[PDB]
């Protein structure tokens, strides 16, 4: 969807082309959802070793 967003700004979307492109803000918070899927997994495989 960033590949969607970058290509469509290269289209200059039909009348809404911004001089922004300031991403998110919850999409930056969506990036923290990935590491909180990773920090959840490192402790539950830590219980798996024993």
């Amino acid at each position: 969807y960033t590949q969607v967003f970058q290509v469509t700004v290269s289209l200059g979307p039909e009348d809404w082309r911004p001089h922004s492109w300031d991403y998110g803000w919850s999409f930056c918070l969506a990036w923290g959802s990935f590491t909180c899927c990773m920090a959840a997994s490192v402790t539950t495989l830590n219980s798996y070793t024993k």
Binding site: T2, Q3, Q6, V7
Partner: peptide
């Protein structure tokens, strides 16, 4: 960024290989 996102498919396609070789080892278990 556009040259770098098509190469994610060989990453995730390898990630699908990570379980299929592992799950048959559970059949080896």
């Amino acid at each position: 960024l556009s040259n770098v996102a098509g190469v994610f498919y060989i990453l995730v396609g390898g990630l699908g290989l990570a379980m299929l070789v592992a799950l048959i080892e559970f059949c080896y278990k």
